[model samples]
Target: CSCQEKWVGYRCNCYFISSEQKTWNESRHLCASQKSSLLQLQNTDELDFMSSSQQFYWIGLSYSEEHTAWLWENGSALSQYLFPSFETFNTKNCIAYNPNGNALDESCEDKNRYICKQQLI
Candidate 1:
């Protein structure tokens, strides 16, 4: 049995879809290059899939200077449904999913790794 199948338990290699722990600006570019943006926990399902015991991960969330409001990394509206308070303090414009299902925050420049989900044979 291969390690991929054991970990993902599927026919594909699931990518965490993360960056090299870069700033809000740099991280965005890197993510976009891979045809992916910072992680976005649009729903509980997606969040559940990306859960990790590690610290916070960068998302599309950032302070939109044009609108002067928080926005998703994918240019989506920062709807209250997604984020109640639009969290952004120590780690501005960064997002992460908890593998352990614990809700908390972490620095975008914390040098943590990311996961990118995909399939191969």
Candidate 2:
């Protein structure tokens, strides 16, 4: 199976919807504790399903001071053409799935629901 208990599957990943609100860092830790990571958008293949009934679900995208760019949790640089481009540190640092536009950057300190993602076993 591509997913585990409590997680729903779509394509190559398994997604878990969070019931608790948390800061981006807190959410990131929770996912990692479960051997997963915050949601990473490598493509639009799973967008429709993920946003079907979601809100400010914090994603893996965040500002990386070291790289001076937006990067995913695993350190993959954002694809400027595939996603909205951001000006240098103009706003919050973390990204979330906002449904309307989907990929949005939000404040890391703000509490919000989050989605955890794990690769297929």
Candidate 3:
């Protein structure tokens, strides 16, 4: 099921695919199977625009380098993010939205939970 709301954009690229929570990896795989990788902001402007609620959401940032260098799981270079190097560290791979205005580094294998986002261009 899906819901609709208004954001400061021409078309709503954000979607709610499920309320059932899944791990970060699970969410990434699920999104990849659909040809996407969670969600990614195009710049800080978008982040500011999205901070109305500041509810952290899933994005395409994934840690590489044995926990360093955040890269796009979908193999695309991201053009935007609150911290371009938010989770860009050698010991950070699995990414999550930092409601605190800063992304926190976490273990990819840690199966806590996550929310997925995707953009339709």
Candidate 4:
């Protein structure tokens, strides 16, 4: 009878924030293990909802200089407008968004709290 707890439903999506910290790749693996994905900020509202805290949370956005673009975990290109203005010296590959609406580039090996999302069934 206890079919619900950590998963929060919103706009046809279910979001879950991890209580533990993990590296970007590790977080992605964790999400995949749960049949979800590292939360993708598809719009401003979702971004606002996810980044409602000062704490940092890993996201699905990453840059690939080989492809010359930032992409989501699903292989979709990130919108130019959604791109954050920050100087990373092309070193950071993963991205972490903050409550201030800034998507900061960070090392993939750095551990941080992460959010996962699955389509609401």
Model 4 lDDT tens row, 39-89: 777765684555467787888888777787777888887777765473452
Q: Is candidate 3 or candidate 4 better by TM-score?
A: 4
lDDT of each: 0.51, 0.76, 0.53, 0.75
Deviation (Å) of 51 in candidate 2:
4.5
Using lDDT as the measure, the top candidate is 2
* Tens digit per residue, CA lDDT, model 3, 1-121: 2323422232355443344456777887776666545656454444444455444455567755653345666655544444756435444446656434556556765544443455665
Better of 1 and 2 by TM-score: 2
Off by over 4 Å in 4: 1-4, 47-51, 86-91
| Candidate 1 lDDT, 37-106, residue by residue in tens | 5555545445455445466555556566787666666577666656544454333424554555333445
Cα error, candidate 1, residue 99 (Å):
4.6
| Candidate number with greatest TM-score | 2
Q: Which window of ten consecutive residues has the lowest lDDT sum in model 2?
A: 83-92
Rank order by lDDT, top first? 2, 4, 3, 1
Clashing pairs in 3: 38-117, 42-80, 43-80, 63-93, 67-90, 67-91, 67-92, 68-89, 68-90
TM-score of each: 0.57, 0.84, 0.57, 0.83
Count of backbone collisions in candidate 3: 9
Question: Where does candidate 1 stray beyond 4 Å?
Answer: 1-15, 50-52, 87-93, 96-121
